[PDB]
Design a protein around this ligand. Structure first.
Ligand code: MET
Ligand SMILES: [Mg+2]
Ligand SMILES: [Mg+2]
Ligand SMILES: [Mg+2]
Ligand SMILES: [Mg+2]
Ligand SMILES: [Zn+2]
Lengths: 86, 102, 129, 229, 267
RNA sequence: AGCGCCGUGGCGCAGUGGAAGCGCGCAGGGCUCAUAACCCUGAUGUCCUCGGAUCGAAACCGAGCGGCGCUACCA
RNA sequence: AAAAUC
């Protein structure tokens, strides 16, 4: 249940977008986007996708860094969250 | 470098001038540097005077003109072709463009 | 005078709408209130000259069935602060009133002009299209 | 069309029926001071017991062109507002309400390189009509001027407007509504103003605008019938 | 033969909106047949064809498919109809397709009648369809009211009574709409005797069942008792279930328990 | 165990009553210097199985199947 | 208008 994983979508000119799918509601999302923006210097979106869920889209190609934020903010598991190569 | 001697604003001795709004982008610009045009036109175009004249109870009635002053911002007017870029030597020609209707 | 039934055209033409609306000499009671934007569906051509022409034809038919025979022209712009120029469609509306049987007299403009009275929409720097 | 949500705050069928069959016409007559006394014809809903049609009639205002009430075209620019107050049945009788210029002449007279003179006055008439009268003037280029402009110093403006105030007060405080209108129709007040102000500054396009009524006393039927026929 | 139109007149009126089958486009637009008026070819030119500019001249217009068009002009002299695709509102397209499917359904029914009876469809529409579209404004509403009231067939002469019998049989087979009304009730008993109370309450509930309206109060759990009823008119089932509520509450007021409702009678 | 929803051509929605729909994909092409965007072209089905009224059904029903949803573990 | 790469 409620598995967590991150994906990378490429673009023109090597530019990349990162998506974490599934976020616990224990901590709210705007309060988390605020500190995502500073620590990442990348634009972010709390987008709604049907049958998928709320997604915090972020710019760039960063996986260990969103994970490093996750380990400190709410995540205490580091086992359910999956990293995708792509 | 001084683009213009008159600074393209035309105050020279008032410190400050009341600003007026553009009619196209609603920019506040000083009234002196406001590139104004008086648009005197008829209420109907040249292609409609016939129909109105033949559909008029008054035989000799002359249709009245609409008057309004237009205050542009500078950018809208450079965009809307009413004001034209010039060569450097021709900038200083103050006289309005010579009447084509000679 | 052959007893023409007189009215006023009260053509109101914005850049987004055109109003052809005849009423009596007093102007209090309203014979026809068909709107230029009614005659079209795209909602971008509400002020298009065709829409005004068609609404004007509708008004002329309504007048000739009511009994109105002659009309005074009241062209209006948006007035106030928005604009001082006639709407693009109102001209074709007047044309259609013209070529539609009804007699016309006393064409004038009644654009409400302010004495530089209030702040205008847009801010300091204005529209930045 | 039909770009509508129909969010109405509901009947199965609404009987709009005929709105105009329950309506009747009424002919308008002007005060005798106007020559072509017949005015036009206005429509109104037919009488009902609870609400008198004449009640809705008394209080109406009608705009007319002065040339229509004169016949001459020397008064196409003027605009007379009359007031519907009394109705004789299939015919209604009106009292003077106000005067104006059509905007066309107004903006036509306002040219560049000449300073306009605007004057206002508030004054009671002979009987009780509290009026406000405006006066426009334009400084005239002499028939010899090489001076491109014809501007006037503020002192000239102030003396001119004092003279205007005196003339208008003298003209209004003496005469009544009928006399006042009979003076306005030939605009002899214009000639008097020009004659008085020709000593101070040469003046052009003097007119009397926007004869605006502030207050009217209690209505007198006999006077209204006197102004008519 | 299948040729007659659905509506009254032969040539379209002005400013009416219909739905057209596309057949061919050459250089000026699509001059295609009509499927709502009498079969006739009308022209839809390019600047009257796409709300979008004209980038996909093959996508939005499909040769052999039907899309909504609007009448702009009708030359009621020789053969010509002017139609446009852009001048249809976003909401209006829904009503246009509604009317088109309406027309197609009635046309298919009358076409079945004509194919079985070998009568030209023109006579079927003339003797029947147009009088019903005059009396009620439409022939489909008239079939629907024929289902509930035969009197719609009064005053009109059929081509033959067997045609009337076959068409009434076909509309009964097709245009038939027994609304399923369910309520559910919660027995919240804590008392001594509740099972015989449920037994006799449901026995009374099943007793009031009529030959036409049958009720079988079924069980899905201990508290949740479901009342399923069929209502031929949608108004009798609610009364049946209210009477049932009365019966169960009366039975349970005496034994000691309590019975509560979750969903009252709703279709 | 009982009652609600569904049955692709790879995926979804649509028509459900003239007999194979569209978009999303996928593949190729064109646009071009060149990528997206955009513009064309296709090739895949007893639209789950078995019966029935019906000229006719994938569509209307039903006698069964698979997967979802609620009641709720129903001695 | 929307214009992207380099
Ligand atoms: C068969 S009765 C015994 C207890 C029951 N099997 C539980 O549940
Ligand atoms: Mg520079
Ligand atoms: Mg100084
Ligand atoms: Mg710009
Ligand atoms: Mg803003
Ligand atoms: Zn501007």
């Amino acid at each position: 249940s409620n598995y967590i994983h991150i994906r990378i979508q490429q673009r023109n000119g090597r530019k990349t977008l990162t998506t974490v799918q599934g976020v616990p509601e224990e901590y709210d999302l705007k309060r988390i986007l605020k500190v995502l923006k500073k620590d990442f210097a990348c634009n972010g979106n709390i987008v709604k996708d049907p049958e998928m869920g709320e997604i915090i889209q972020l710019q760039g190609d960063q996986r260990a860094k969103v994970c490093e934020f996750m380990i400190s903010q709410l995540g205490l598991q580091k086992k359910n969250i999956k990293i995708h190569g792509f | 470098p001084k683009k213009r001697a008159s600074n393209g604003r035309n105050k020279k001795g008032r410190g400050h001038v009341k600003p007026v709004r553009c009619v196209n982008c609603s920019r506040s610009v000083p009234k002196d540097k406001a590139i104004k045009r008086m648009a005197i036109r008829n209420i109907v175009e040249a292609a409609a005077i016939r129909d109105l004249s033949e559909a008029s109870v008054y035989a000799e009635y002359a249709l009245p003109k609409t008057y309004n002053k237009l205050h542009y911002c500078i950018s809208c007017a450079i965009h809307a072709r009413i004001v034209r870029v010039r060569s450097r030597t021709d900038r200083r020609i103050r006289a309005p463009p010579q009447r084509p209707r000679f | 005078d052959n007893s023409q039934v007189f009215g006023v055209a009260r053509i109101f033409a914005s850049f987004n709408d055109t109003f052809v609306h005849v009423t009596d000499l007093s102007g209090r009671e309203t014979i026809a209130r068909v709107t230029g934007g009614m005659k079209v569906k795209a909602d971008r051509d509400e002020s298009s000259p065709y829409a005004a022409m068609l609404a004007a034809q509708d008004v002329a038919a309504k007048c000739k069935e009511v009994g109105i025979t002659a009309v005074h022209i009241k062209i209006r712009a948006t007035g106030g602060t928005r604009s001082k120029t006639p709407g693009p469609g109102g001209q074709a509306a007047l044309r259609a009133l013209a070529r539609s049987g009804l007699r016309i007299g006393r064409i004038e403009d009644v654009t409400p002009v302010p004495s530089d009275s209030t702040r205008k929409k847009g801010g300091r720097r204005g529209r930045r299209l | 069309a039909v770009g509508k949500n129909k969010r109405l705050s509901k009947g199965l069928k609404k009987r709009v029926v005929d709105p105009f069959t329950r309506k009747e016409w009424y002919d308008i007559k002007a005060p005798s001071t106007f020559e072509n006394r017949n005015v036009g014809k206005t429509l109104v809903n037919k009488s009902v017991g609870l609400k008198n049609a004449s009640d809705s009639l008394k209080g109406r205002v009608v705009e007319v062109c002065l040339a229509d009430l004169q016949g001459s075209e020397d008064h196409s620019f003027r605009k007379v507002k009359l007031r519907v107050d009394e109705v004789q049945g299939k015919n209604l009788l009106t009292n003077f309400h106000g005067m104006d210029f059509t905007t066309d002449k107004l903006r036509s007279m306002v040219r560049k390189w000449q300073t306009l003179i605007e004057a206002n006055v508030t004054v009671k008439t002979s009987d009780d009509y509290v009026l406000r009268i405006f006066a426009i003037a334009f400084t005239r280029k002499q028939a010899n001027q090489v001076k491109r402009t014809s501007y006037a110093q503020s002192s000239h403006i102030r003396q001119i407007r004092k003279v205007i105030s005196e003339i208008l007060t003298r003209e209004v405080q003496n005469s009544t509504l009928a006399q006042l209108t009979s003076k306005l129709i030939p605009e002899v007040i214009n000639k008097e103003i020009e004659n008085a102000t020709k000593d101070i500054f040469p003046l052009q396009n003097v007119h009397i605008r926007k004869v605006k009524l502030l207050k009217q006393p209690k209505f007198d039927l006999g006077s209204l019938l006197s102004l008519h026929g | 033969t299948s040729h007659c139109r659905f509506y009254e007149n032969k040539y379209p009126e002005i400013d009416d909106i219909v739905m057209v089958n596309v057949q061919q486009i050459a250089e000026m637009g699509a001059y295609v047949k009509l499927l709502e008026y009498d079969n006739i070819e009308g022209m839809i030119l390019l600047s009257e064809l796409s709300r979008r500019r004209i980038r996909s001249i093959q996508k939005l217009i499909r040769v052999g498919k039907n899309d909504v068009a609007v009448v702009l002009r009708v030359d009621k002299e020789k053969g010509y109809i002017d139609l446009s695709k852009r001048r249809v509102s976003s909401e209006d397209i829904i009503k246009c397709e509604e009317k088109y499917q309406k027309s197609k359904t009635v046309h298919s029914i009358l076409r079945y009648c004509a194919e079985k009876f070998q009568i030209p469809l023109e006579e079927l529409y003339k003797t029947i369809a147009w009088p019903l579209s005059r009396k009620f404004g439409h022939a489909y509403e008239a079939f629907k009211l024929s289902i509930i009231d035969e009197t719609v067939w009064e005053g009109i002469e059929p081509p033959s009574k067997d045609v009337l019998d076959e068409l009434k049989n076909y509309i009964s087979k097709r245009l038939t709409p027994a609304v399923k009304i369910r309520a559910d009730v919660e027995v919240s008993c804590f008392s001594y005797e509740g099972i015989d109370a449920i037994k006799d309450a449901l026995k009374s509930a099943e007793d009031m069942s009529t030959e036409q309206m049958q009720v079988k109060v079924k069980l899905v759990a201990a508290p949740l008792y479901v009342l399923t009823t069929q209502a031929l008119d949608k108004q009798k089932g609610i009364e049946q279930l209210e009477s049932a509520i009365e019966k169960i509450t009366e039975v349970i007021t005496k034994y000691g328990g309590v019975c509560n409702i979750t969903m009252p009678p709703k279709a």
